Amino acid sequence: MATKLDYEDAVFYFVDDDKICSRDSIIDLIDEYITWRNHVIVFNKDITSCGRLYKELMKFDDVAIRYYGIDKINEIVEAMSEGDHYINFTKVHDQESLFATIGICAKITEHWGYKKISESRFQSLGNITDLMTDDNINILILFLEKKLN
Secondary structure, three states, X not given: OOOOOOOOOOOOOHHHOOOOOOXXXXXXXXXXXXXXXXXXXXXXXXXXXXXXXXXXXXXXXXXXXXXXXXXXXHHHHHHHHOOOOOOOOOOOOOHHXXXXXXXXXXXXXXXXXXXXXXXXXXXXXXXXXXXXXXXXXXHHXXXXXXXXX
8 A cells, every 4th residue: 555656767877787897887886876775765766676786785784784783873873864963983994894884874875765854954965975985996896796797
């Protein structure tokens, strides 16, 4: 019982790429994915609605659940949605945290979709692609390449 068109407006290209892309592609990719995590919500698309590359990004949710922890993530995501948060920072620690930074952000971007949560309409976004690095892109290609390419 649901009266709602399955919206897409699938702007993302590498969403369903299925295979490994360029360094320059993981650049836009993070923008696409973090936005796609949102589209599954706002438009209420599908999580399965994508390609191979994206499935691994989903696992960065998990890596974050492992790292930051489901508890913290739960507290954190919700914090984001009231426009008041907290957070610590990592840098040269672990690739695990590198990935974790994406998924933790991904859980936040999705959660907002239903009503377009943020409360603060201004500065509702910012560091999404800048939350990771071209250097991370290389790691990303590599991680994916394990099954990708």
